[PDB]
Write an enzyme that holds these catalytic residues in place. Structure first.
Site, PDB file in Angstrom:
ATOM      1  N   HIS A 132     -38.472  30.124  45.638  1.00 31.13           N
ATOM      2  CA  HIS A 132     -38.809  29.489  44.372  1.00 31.13           C
ATOM      3  C   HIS A 132     -38.114  30.212  43.229  1.00 31.13           C
ATOM      4  CE1 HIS A 132     -42.761  27.516  45.992  1.00 31.13           C
ATOM      5  NE2 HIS A 132     -41.661  26.986  46.499  1.00 31.13           N
ATOM      6  N   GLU A 183     -39.183  31.697  40.556  1.00 32.34           N
ATOM      7  CA  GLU A 183     -39.774  33.012  40.271  1.00 32.34           C
ATOM      8  C   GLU A 183     -39.342  34.072  41.283  1.00 32.34           C
ATOM      9  OE1 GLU A 183     -41.092  30.097  40.457  1.00 32.34           O
ATOM     10  OE2 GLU A 183     -43.103  29.902  39.613  1.00 32.34           O
ATOM     11  N   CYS A 186     -46.443  28.535  41.168  1.00 28.90           N
ATOM     12  CA  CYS A 186     -47.266  28.087  42.292  1.00 28.90           C
ATOM     13  C   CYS A 186     -48.219  29.208  42.723  1.00 28.90           C
ATOM     14  CB  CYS A 186     -46.401  27.624  43.475  1.00 28.90           C
ATOM     15  SG  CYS A 186     -45.572  28.975  44.444  1.00 28.90           S
ATOM     16  N   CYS A 211     -46.132  32.138  44.123  1.00 30.89           N
ATOM     17  CA  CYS A 211     -45.432  32.912  43.097  1.00 30.89           C
ATOM     18  C   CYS A 211     -46.413  33.682  42.219  1.00 30.89           C
ATOM     19  CB  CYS A 211     -44.547  31.984  42.244  1.00 30.89           C
ATOM     20  SG  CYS A 211     -43.118  31.283  43.138  1.00 30.89           S
TER      21      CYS A 211
HETATM   22 ZN   LIG Z   1     -43.576  29.080  43.280  1.00 31.30          ZN
END
Ligand SMILES: [Zn+2]
Ligand SMILES: [Br-]
Ligand SMILES: [Br-]
Ligand SMILES: [Zn+2]
Lengths: 162, 280
Positions: free
Chosen positions: A58, A60, A94, A97
């Site tokens: 992701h 992040e 999310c 993350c």
């Molecule tokens: Zn994420």
């Protein structure tokens, strides 16, 4: 050295926006982000899930890896850098993350639009401020910045996937 | 000595609900086979295939008798006669007693304490077999061996393995590797990186679809959520972790609002794993 990053929120987030657009173009979930330490950008990441074929990549987590590389290459203790770093991301981290930023002891996330499918700063779970005594430190959130712009890109992307 | 416990959502962890059905005693043991055929052709109970249709009962001397599961009860479950429940000639009710209402499990049991409450009311279908139990043991002695190697090195004592249940081929073994430069290399994150680099050019990023993960102890929030992102199909672990996200503090493997759910079994070689490290 933490609130010193916050002054250019306009600039930092405009730059996260230009990366969300890039991810969008390359069939990635349109999420971009920057990591600012002491008014210098020490890490940028857009979502690289489909390019790398690795679900965990992701935005992040691409940025975290980039900061840690910056810490390695410059001989700086990641603890002292992360703890005074602000993350600017166009979509609410999310659940995964959020736990990542907690374990990195990042103090402050500025984010745009709600993550309704996976959000970890309140939307699905509140990993961001939960009582997890063995999963890092909770961080604080400035939600909402340019949310109407950011949520449109999500809505575009999912109208585009199967 | 160990036993596998399912971690299900809170909704599915409760007691199985009951519904009312009509059963009748089989007074003529030698009509049993015949009566079972004729009845379940009329009342096939298509939505309760976990129910056995013949319930045995050992008398105080071992003398066996049996009732037969006639059908589901209607909106008004009053007393009902054989003549009212079983049409003729389609059913020859010779050998049956007067029908009676009995609560039966509405849905098949999942946990072993749910098989207990449910077999109490009416026999049901259903944990792991010998062959499988030994095989799951092998994969979990492998994670344990890996967790011990990390402990001797100076890293967190957490072991993980990813296994393809179609061939039982181990696809990636790894332990915790968090360091000061690289603090997020938990055992689960390392296995997902190892599977990822080993997969082919035509692969969807759901690197773990279909695969099983065995890990010494229950993953943290970060690992668990990554498993959901990676679309693991089943996760086995030994001991819980205080901040664990597949059963202890969260049950992210069984939410409705994530686009993926998967089975988690805890307690496999738990006696050994309990002395190892929790995640994180
Ligand atoms: Zn994420
Ligand atoms: Br078992
Ligand atoms: Br949950
Ligand atoms: Zn973890």
């Amino acid at each position: 050295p933490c609130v010193v990053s916050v002054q250019e929120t306009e600039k930092w987030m405009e730059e996260a926006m230009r990366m969300a657009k890039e991810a969008l173009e390359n069939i990635e979930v349109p999420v971009g982000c920057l990591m600012v330490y002491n008014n210098e950008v020490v890490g940028k990441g857009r979502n690289e899930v489909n390019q790398t074929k690795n679900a965990t990549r992701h935005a992040e987590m691409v940025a975290i890896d980039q900061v840690l590389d910056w810490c390695h290459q410059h001989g700086q203790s990641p603890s002292t850098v992360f703890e005074h770093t602000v993350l600017y991301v166009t979509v609410e981290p999310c659940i995964m993350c959020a736990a990542a930023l907690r374990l990195m002891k990042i103090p402050l996330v500025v984010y745009g639009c709600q993550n309704e499918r996976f959000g970890g700063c309140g939307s699905v779970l509140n990993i961001a401020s939960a009582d997890l005594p063995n999963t890092g430190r909770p961080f604080q959130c400035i939600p909402g910045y340019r949310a109407e712009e950011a949520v449109e890109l999500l809505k575009t992307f999912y109208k585009q996937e199967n | 000595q160990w036993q596998a416990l399912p971690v299900l959502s809170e909704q599915q962890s409760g007691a199985v609900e009951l519904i009312l059905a009509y059963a009748a005693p089989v007074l003529d043991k030698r009509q049993t086979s015949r009566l079972l055929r004729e009845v379940s052709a009329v009342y096939p109970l298509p939505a309760q295939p976990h129910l056995k249709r013949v319930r045995p009962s050992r008398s105080a001397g071992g003398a066996q008798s049996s009732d037969l599961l006639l059908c589901l009860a209607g909106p008004s479950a009053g007393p009902r006669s054989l003549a009212e429940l079983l049409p003729r000639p389609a059913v020859d009710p010779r050998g049956l007693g007067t029908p009676f209402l009995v609560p039966v499990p509405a849905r098949p049991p999942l946990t072993r304490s749910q098989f207990e409450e449910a077999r109490a009311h009416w026999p049901t279908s259903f944990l792991f077999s010998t062959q499988e139990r030994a095989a799951m043991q092998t994969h979990m002695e492998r994670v344990v061996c890996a967790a011990q190697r990390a402990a001797a090195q100076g890293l967190r004592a957490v072991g993980a393995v990813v296994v393809d249940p179609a061939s039982d081929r181990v696809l990636a073994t790894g332990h915790d590797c968090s360091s000061v430069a690289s603090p997020l290399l938990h055992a689960v994150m390392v296995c997902i990186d190892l599977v990822a680099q080993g997969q082919g050019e035509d692969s969807l990023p759901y690197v773990c679809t279909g695969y099983d993960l065995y890990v010494t102890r229950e993953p943290c929030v970060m690992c668990a959520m990554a498993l959901v992102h990676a679309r693991i199909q089943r996760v086995f672990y030994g001991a819980p972790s205080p901040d664990g996200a597949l059963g202890t503090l969260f049950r992210v493997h069984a939410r409705p609002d994530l686009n993926h759910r998967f089975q988690v079994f805890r307690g496999i070689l738990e006696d050994q794993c309990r002395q190892l490290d929790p995640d994180p």
